[PDB]
Amino acid sequence: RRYKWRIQTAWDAGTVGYSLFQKFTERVKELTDGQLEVQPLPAGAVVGTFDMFDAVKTGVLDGMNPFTLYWAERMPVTAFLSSYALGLDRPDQWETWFYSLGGLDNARRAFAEQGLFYVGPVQHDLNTIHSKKPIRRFEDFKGVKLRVPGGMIAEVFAAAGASTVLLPGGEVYPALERGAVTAVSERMYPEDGALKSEIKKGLRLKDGGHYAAVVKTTYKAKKPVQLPGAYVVDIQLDIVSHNEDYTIVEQCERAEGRHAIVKEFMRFKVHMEGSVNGHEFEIEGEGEGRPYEAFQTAKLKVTKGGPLPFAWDILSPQFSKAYIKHPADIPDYFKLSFPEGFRWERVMYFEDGGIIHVDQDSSLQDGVFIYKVKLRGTNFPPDGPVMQKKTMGWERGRSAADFVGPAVNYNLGFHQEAKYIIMGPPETPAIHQPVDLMDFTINLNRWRSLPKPLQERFIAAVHEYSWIHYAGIQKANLEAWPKYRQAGVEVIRLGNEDVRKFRRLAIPIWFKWAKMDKYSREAFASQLEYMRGIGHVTDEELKGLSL
Numbered sequence: 001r002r003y004k005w006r007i008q009t010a011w012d013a014g015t016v017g018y019s020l021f022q023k024f025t026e027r028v029k030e031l032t033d034g035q036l037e038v039q040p041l042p043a044g045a046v047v048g049t050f051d052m053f054d055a056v057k058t059g060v061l062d063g064m065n066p067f068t069l070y071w072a073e074r075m076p077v078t079a080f081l082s083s084y085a086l087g088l089d090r091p092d093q094w095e096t097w098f099y100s101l102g103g104l105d106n107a108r109r110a111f112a113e114q115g116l117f118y119v120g121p122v123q124h125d126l127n128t129i130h131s132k133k134p135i136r137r138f139e140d141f142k143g144v145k146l147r148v149p150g151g152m153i154a155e156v157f158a159a160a161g162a163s164t165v166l167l168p169g170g171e172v173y174p175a176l177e178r179g180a181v182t183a184v185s186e187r188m189y190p191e192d193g194a195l196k197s198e199i200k201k202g203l204r205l206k207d208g209g210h211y212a213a214v215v216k217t218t219y220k221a222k223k224p225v226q227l228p229g230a231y232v233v234d235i236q237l238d239i240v241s242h243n244e245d246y247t248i249v250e251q252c253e254r255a256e257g258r259h260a261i262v263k264e265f266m267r268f269k270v271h272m273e274g275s276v277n278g279h280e281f282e283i284e285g286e287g288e289g290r291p292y293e294a295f296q297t298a299k300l301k302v303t304k305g306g307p308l309p310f311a312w313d314i315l316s317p318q319f320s321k322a323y324i325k326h327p328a329d330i331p332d333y334f335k336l337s338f339p340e341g342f343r344w345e346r347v348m349y350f351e352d353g354g355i356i357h358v359d360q361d362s363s364l365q366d367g368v369f370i371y372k373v374k375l376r377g378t379n380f381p382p383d384g385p386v387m388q389k390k391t392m393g394w395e396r397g398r399s400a401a402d403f404v405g406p407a408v409n410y411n412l413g414f415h416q417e418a419k420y421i422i423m424g425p426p427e428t429p430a431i432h433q434p435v436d437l438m439d440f441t442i443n444l445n446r447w448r449s450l451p452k453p454l455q456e457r458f459i460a461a462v463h464e465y466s467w468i469h470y471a472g473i474q475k476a477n478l479e480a481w482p483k484y485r486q487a488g489v490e491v492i493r494l495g496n497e498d499v500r501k502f503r504r505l506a507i508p509i510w511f512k513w514a515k516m517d518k519y520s521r522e523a524f525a526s527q528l529e530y531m532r533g534i535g536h537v538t539d540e541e542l543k544g545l546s547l
């Protein structure tokens with residue numbers, strides 16, 4: 001008689017995507033004279049997006065409309081049932097692989113082992129990258145925090161130096177931002193009776209690139225003091241003003257920790273002596289701020305060895321841990337150490353081999369903080385950015401995030417948080433996901449209960465919808481590009497050379513995923529044969545590689 005099915009889709013309510021899905025659900029009733037009814041459910045309605053696989057398998061849901069490569073961790077073959085970086089990159093080629101070169105049956109055998117019936121692929125779109133900052137070349141991906149959908153997509157970007165996270169499309173921007181600063185933030189941790197920290201944030205270079213720096217610090221109170229548990233410190237340090245040659249500088253900072261004699265207002269005095277590539281100097285300074293509001297400013301003056309022949313930025317973090325706001329349930333190691341105070345030792349490592357060792361002593365005399373600093377920097381290349389003053393302060397952390405194509409990403413508000421779009425060159429507009437396929441998968445028991453006449457009709461329905469969906473998305477994307485311009489969003493194109501650099505990374509990662517199990521091996525072997533047959537892949541790009 002009448003069959004009812006609940007199917008949840010990866011599309012959020014109020015997307016172009018979701019509207020196309022409900023339309024399909026009405027088409028299925030038409031194509032079956034009301035014998036099969038599909039109740040559509042937006043993302044999250046019944047279970048979370050990434051929980052759909054287990055919900056369908058167990059029958060909580062009858063079926064799902066996911067992005068197929070979300071199952072890459074638990075079914076390697078599914079990394080090969082949607083585009084991967086710099087492989088087959090036209091919708092028609094994936095249609096051919098699926099419907100004549102054996103892809104569909106490969107997919108069906110793999111899913112049936114899980115108690116799922118893979119109906120067929122649904123054509124969708126290519127994907128864009130929405131970024132807060134201008135990523136203008138391959139090297140700019142290093143240090144970026146990037147949301148991506150895992151599997152081979154994430155592996156390729158991790159090999160290009162990105163930190164990757166997996167989040168559902170609907171939930172990228174409350175969080176990815178927090179995550180990026182969590183990265184750039186110092187990481188406090190108790191060890192061996194000291195409070196230690198590690199900071200992993202790049203300098204900003206005038207050419208837009210970044211220059212990596214690893215900061216390791218040991219802080220030790222001069223009297224025994226309660227150590228805290230591990231925690232995090234958001235610190236933002238600005239250079240407020242400077243003279244021409246930086247012999248007089250004003251900086252200020254706000255610092256906050258998260259999971260009687262130190263008065264509300266405190267002044268400090270600092271003296272630094274140091275050497276960088278053999279250039280000796282001294283600095284004297286005076287500062288003030290609000291230790292519990294954690295806002296401080298200071299004025300520094302080069303008293304010897306001025307002008308300094310290197311970037312001020314390597315000294316700025318050396319000039320005040322008493323001025324960090326700590327919540328009540330995090331012991332304040334720095335404040336509790338007073339009046340005797342504390343010492344620290346630091347070893348900053350850069351990416352060109354430059355090294356700085358720093359020693360600091362912090363005490364309290366007469367109601368004023370006294371800081372003494374000794375700094376030794378060596379091994380900076382003479383032409384490098386530190387010695388040639390080509391740096392601009394410290395990165396606050398960089399967020400970029402793939403999700404889908406331009407319309408639906410606009411539905412989800414990406415234009416508000418990110419003012420750049422990163423695409424490939426016109427030859428290769430999508431480097432990571434040119435053909436981002438969805439599918440329909442039905443609980444296997446549900447499927448086999450359906451009369452074979454309705455089975456065939458549902459398969460036909462899905463094949464028709466694959467291209468209606470595709471066509472609908474593509475139309476919306478045409479409307480979206482003008483809205484991006486109105487929002488102030490700038491489209492950046494990478495170069496052919498940038499593509500070559502991704503390609504060297506991508507091909508070996510293909511073969512590693514291919515060799516995970518028998519299904520992944522079978523599917524990649526047939527994709528590779530096709531790619532070789534149409535001149536996608538040369539024999540030479542392949543040298544040293546074999547299933």
Ligand SMILES: [Ca+2]
Nearest residue numbers: 127402403404
């Ligand atoms: Ca994507």
